Amino acid sequence: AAQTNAPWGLARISSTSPGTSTYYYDESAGQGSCVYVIDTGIEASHPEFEGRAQMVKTYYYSSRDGNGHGTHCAGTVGSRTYGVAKKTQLFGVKVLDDNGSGQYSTIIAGMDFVASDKNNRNCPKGVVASLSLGGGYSSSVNSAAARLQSSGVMVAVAAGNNNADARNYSPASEPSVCTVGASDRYDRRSSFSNYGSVLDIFGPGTDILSTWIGGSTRSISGTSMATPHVAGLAAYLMTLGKTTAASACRYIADTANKGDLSNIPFGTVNLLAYNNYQA
């Protein structure tokens, strides 16, 4: 399948070269998989989600996304126009308030929630979690991410936006999850992207168009935007049967475009997420 005039990041993940604008993908499109977006919520009524999104948990007085960040990330995973995996099921877990903030205790509870809740959901092709959040190093936060992964969920986490080594941030620094840095449309490391040996992969993160609250759209930047590209890619590949939750991060690294990014510090992987789709 081909989506013409797609957001640059979608085109990038199906291309061996920068500078193209069509996204190519197998029409299965992540059907039968599920992606949990652990964030500020998801505006599930957005036409872009087509009934495939639902809120399943909140830790606040409402499950509504009053911020937009979670809705944007969910759109990059799985919206019809802006999403990698256009037929996946999206589940919202609101661990962040409408200012985008959350206590580590709440974030941990949300991860443990997903590890169990996937057993209430029909996800025959597999389960992914997208975590576009983090703060300073916490062994308890890293442990929770490790448990979520161990339970059979492909965990993709943002490296962070400090232009610093991600070893000092959580859950970015948990080795067993998939830690995602950000790139721009010219194949440069995004100016704010964290780096370091803990990174597994880069995805598009600068100037990413996706869904927003109020039934709208906007372009924003962050490792928060790169992470759902990788989460959606994992769901897409799991639906194709090419990999599993336990092996998808390694598979994405194995099949990535290699050596094509600029300003990658020595010791950080030079790997850009790629779907290897051939029509």
Ligand SMILES: NC(=O)c1cccnc1
């Ligand atoms: N995808 C590519 O063209 C490429 C270029 C250089 C090294 N590895 C891969």
